[PDB]
Structure 1
């Protein structure tokens, strides 16, 4: 039940001695970096088109399955596509399909076929590739991809078998993707919030220390940063971005902390407990190093506007005369 320190949870108790500094360049650079990461007009049109085409086919399939063997109960758009946190370069969208029958590898393939086949009949000129996977199946154009995460209905989960029906792990992670999608669209659909989650993905990709951080965790974190605060008002991008580092540094996702509770589970599950102690130490001290680096005015480096910076969190660096030593491991295996 321990809540780690968070300056923006008790801002009143820390009166400012002098007017906040002019973080105009930092804020401007924050947006600049976002424009670079945000999908272009072509990518949006691509994934749009492809997702639109497929979703309809599935929709249709539900109502008038006709002489078709696989009964689909429902379909729901999920993932960055729906959340609005996609990234240039990764033009992939996600859709979860709920089957009324127990999901078999054979039905999954039968379905993937019916869909793609019906897409190639409505537009033979459009080259499409369809491949099945562990999760379900996937259809990709030359410009964009769509992953169909195949699941089932709760009642079946209890009746599922490990030899003929997909793994209960995959089936339930799909179901969770739905919840996450809903929750997000009901609580996280704020401009800055989305812009932050995008930047968070990038940060995690350019600092190997943030690697254990899952996407769901990045959503919940990006939300907390902007929205969770006494005053029912979203924080500025620059303020919530620095706060992301600050809360990780104060050990939000460390042992003994309540961290962040999963809104899409029961009853009170700590999201970060998907990470190992070793990883928790890492996420923390990585964030700690960046907090200090940021205070010394290295937002460009920390944003990826000055090339490779992963070294900033493992090697000594000197910022205007101040010698910076990266925070070091403190966890002790058995």
Structure 2
């Protein structure tokens, strides 16, 4: 029931002494990095093209009297592609295909062949490769790849056989991906929120202390920081970014904290509990160090505009005469 301290839940009780410092450089640096990280015109066109082709082949297989009409219930676009949080260099989109039948390894490989053959017949000049995985399969062009996440209808889940069908974990994840996609589109489709999530993905990748943070946790954390506030109005990208560091530092994802509740599960699951106590400690003390590094005006370092910076979270640094000592482990056992 404990809600950690969050300044932007009670700004009124903290009147500013002087006028807010000018963070124009920080604001412009945030956008600049987003441009860096955002997919280019070619990438956007490749994944658009590939997803569209594949989606129609599947739309057609659903109402196309055959092996896969008695096999596929529906198909949903999910992931950063649908949300608009993709990152240049990783041109991969996800589709969840719900099977009516029990999902076996063979029905999956057969579905993959079917789909990659429809494409090859429509356009034999374009080179495609199709490989199956544990979660389903994926089709790759030379510029983009589309992942198909295979699952089945809920009635089927209570009737699986660990020896024949896919693992329940995978089937549940796919279904959850659809929930996350639906929730994100109704609640998290704001401009700033999308830019923040992209920037947060980059932050994690450059500070190993943030590794434990899952993508889904980043979506919620991104929506929370921007939207969840008294006024209800969206925060400025800069303010929301710093808030992201501040609420992690204040122990949002620590023991005893309500953290963020999963809006796609029941009844009141805490999304951060997927992490270990050791990892929670790490996420927190890594965010705590960055909170301080930011107050000293090290936004360019933190944003990835000045080479490696992962040491900033393990080494002593001095910022304009101020000796900064990284927050250290506290959890034991």
Structure 1 and Structure 2 fold alike (TM over 0.5): yes
Could you say if the C-alpha distance between residues 32 and 68 of structure 1 is closer, same or farther in structure 2, counting changes exceeding 3 Å?
closer
The 1-side partners of 2:119 and 2:65 are apart by 16
Q: CA deviation at 1:87?
A: 0.1
Q: Is the 8 A contact 2:93 2:146 kept in 1?
A: yes
Deviation by residue 1:209-240 (Cα, 9 ceiling, x = unmatched): 00000000000000000000000200000000
The Cα shift of 1:110 comes to: 0.6
Q: Does the 8 Å CA contact 1:93/1:145 hold for their aligned counterparts?
A: yes
Contact 1:136 1:150 in 2 (8 A): yes
Q: Give the aligned partner of residue 30 of structure 2.
A: 30
**Contact 2:61-2:69 within 8 A present in 1 as well:** no
Query: 1:256/1:124 Cα in 2 relative to 1: closer, same or farther (>3 Å)?
Result: same
Distance in 2 (alpha carbons) for counterparts of 1:152 and 1:145:
23
Runs of 5+ in structure 2 lacking a partner? none
Residue 114 of structure 1: how far off its partner (Å): 0.4
1: distance between equivalents of 2:288 and 2:68? 56
TM-score computed with the length of structure 2 as normaliser: 0.99
* Whole-angstrom CA distance in 1 between matches of 2:93 and 2:221: 22
Matched residues in 2 for 1:257 and 1:197: separation? 22
C-alpha contact (below 8 Å) 1:70/1:107 kept by paired residues: no
Could you tell me the TM-score, scaled by structure 1's length?
0.99
Q: CA deviation at 1:69?
A: 7.2
* Cα distance in structure 2, aligned partners of 1:69 and 1:111: 11
Q: What are the Cα deviations for residues 185-221 of structure 1, in whole angstroms up to 9, with x where unaligned? A: 0000000000000000000000000000000000000
1:112-123 matches, within 5 Å, as 112-123=112-123
CA offset digits 1:11-60 (Å, max 9, x no partner) = 00000000000000000000000000000000000000000000000000
* Deviation at residue 65 of structure 1 after TM alignment: 3.2
The Cα shift of 1:67 comes to 5.2
Provide the aligned C-alpha RMSD in A. Answer: 0.7
- The separation in 1 between residues aligned to 2:137 and 2:322, in whole angstroms, is 53
In the alignment of these two chains, the number of paired residues is 333
CA drift at 1:66: 2.9
What is the alpha-carbon distance in structure 2 between the residues aligned to residue 329 and residue 58 of structure 1? 50
Contact 1:204 1:211 in 2 (8 A): yes
